[PDB]
């Protein structure tokens with residue numbers, strides 16, 4: 067059923083992708099420095115300062131997005147802005163796209179490790195990365211937009 071493809075993000079994709087976060091919690095999870103409501107301008111500013119912004123496509127629809135917010139040649143990349151269209155969740159889009167990003171870290175950056183950080187409330191995120199072989203390494207305190215204390219779970223995975 068799912069025949070996924072990927073390509074670099076394009077201008078025309080930004081309206082779609084900016085529609086993906088459904089609430090303030092989802093935006094915080096994937097882009098904690100953004101302010102609700104999300105906007106194309108905020109997404110474009112992330113793209114401009116990051117690397118590897120990639121979309122996943124199925125049946126002619128952009129269904130997922132990700133990029134790197136850290137990249138260190140020969141060392142590691144950190145994967146962020148991971149978001150999937152709400153109508154397409156639970157179908158393997160993030161799994162697919164994380165694979166693609168792992169290959170790109172290996173290929174382009176000669177990375178031996180992928181890092182991700184997932185906020186504590188985001189069970190789907192934590193289970194996603196656990197299923198894909200990431201292990202938790204540390205927990206950092208952060209604050210949410212209401213000033214409330216949250217836990218940021220830093221995970222990683224060897225790439226090879």
Ligand SMILES: CC(C)(COP(=O)(O)OP(=O)(O)OC[C@H]1O[C@@H](n2cnc3c(N)ncnc32)[C@H](O)[C@@H]1OP(=O)(O)O)[C@@H](O)C(=O)NCCC(=O)NCCS
Nearest residue numbers: 095096148149150155156157158159160161190191193194
């Ligand atoms: C988290 C998110 C990216 C998952 O994307 P997705 O394409 O729906 O996930 P996939 O279908 O590829 O799922 C892969 C794994 O993620 C986990 N997962 C995804 N959705 C889940 C849910 N609703 N509940 C529990 N686990 C879930 C599971 O471990 C799943 O593996 P399995 O189906 O073999 O059990 C998506 O829910 C999303 O965009 N959320 C808002 C943004 C966000 O939180 N981003 C940061 C998290 S990466």
